[PDB]
Symmetry: D2
Subunit: 115 residues, 4 copies
């Protein structure tokens, strides 16, 4: 699995479950084409977005729908979503984990990239 | 000054200086219209982006050119940039970003 | 003002006000001697902890009473406190802390 | 495994490997008794510190030896170590993961607690 997303909730100290994630790839004409989407599981993970074959070099945007997450918990958060944008596979295939840690007015995101 | 940006460098423990920041407002057609831009000062801050008159309710995007920052330091970064997207609803907004090569955090400090 | 503390609340997007902070210096016997303390202001800051004369090289601990902060808000936190331990080596040190109930980050901004 | 530690390196975007971790428990006489120790693996994880039986209620300190980590990489970091202090198991047994994300002048730590 070359692209995985892991999301944690900093208020509850738990996985962030049922978080919607939309992945896009920057096209030849410079716009963002839909690439993959899904929702985090009970462990706050999202696997199976793509395949090695499909996940070619390019600029990708991983959009994490943080607002919908907080709103469903009664919280009115600051951000609309958390967007993570990166060049992938430009030195050959790598495995990427995009981790996000969420609070209503703050988030962090870290990439763990392995070869 | 209704909107301020503060950027920090977590490798060096310092303000991130000369970091380009572009702000956009979302238009009725769902595109991002350029709104404000500048480069962070010696204190890692960018003030004077707007005025209260100009900064009406709406969805804004603040794009922080983190890639160029790291490149200038000779360090290979992960992200193309850091994007911060939020609705301005009617005080003073401080968007802060703490930068590392493969990680960043962003926090909104909203005050009167 | 060689040592400043800044505390932020990541749930509310605000300075963390009235947060008690205790600073200690490590003594020759490896114990922590009380050094400075105060409570954060309305801007989440604590200034005037020391002077340059007093703030000699050595290992310091800054303890931030995060548990009491959350309790006062009716929120159940994880940590007993946030501890920040570092060697002062000879400028101006700003210890910043971003607080959430089950998470915190701390950053040193060291400048001239 | 009721207590696990996971450490990531924010400069390299990788697990933080061979990080020394020392765990202490606050004693009856108010001092910190050694409780467990170990080092993170190639995945940046440390399992097997304790057992359910041994990990009774108490105040614990997880000390992460961040300085030694950075120094071994040629970096002179700000902090001596990252200390995480918490009451454990005071509402019955829980599983705790103490995650730390490291940069030379900054770190964050998050607890994920499951029942
Ligand atoms: O600061 C950020 O955004 C990153 C902070 O996330 N911490 C991460 C974390 C926390 C608890 C349990 C597992 C993981 C994990 C696994 C793989 C990759 C990253 C992380
Ligand atoms: O980790 C994050 O995203 C938050 C970390 O930022 N720390 C902040 C910080 C650090 C040093 C000096 C001044 C400030 C500041 C001012 C206004 C608002 C936020 C912050």
């Amino acid at each position: 699995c070359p692209l995985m997303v892991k999301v944690l909730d900093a208020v509850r100290g738990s996985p962030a479950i049922n978080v919607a994630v939309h992945v896009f790839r920057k096209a030849a004409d410079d716009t963002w084409e839909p690439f993959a989407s899904g929702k985090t599981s009970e462990s706050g993970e999202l696997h199976g977005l793509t395949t090695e074959e499909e996940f070619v070099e390019g600029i990708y945007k991983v959009e994490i729908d943080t607002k919908s997450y907080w709103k469903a918990l009664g919280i009115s958060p600051f951000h609309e979503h958390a967007e993570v944008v990166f060049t992938a596979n430009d030195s050959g295939p790598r495995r990427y984990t995009i981790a996000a840690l969420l609070s209503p007015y703050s988030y962090s995101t870290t990439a763990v990239v392995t070869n």
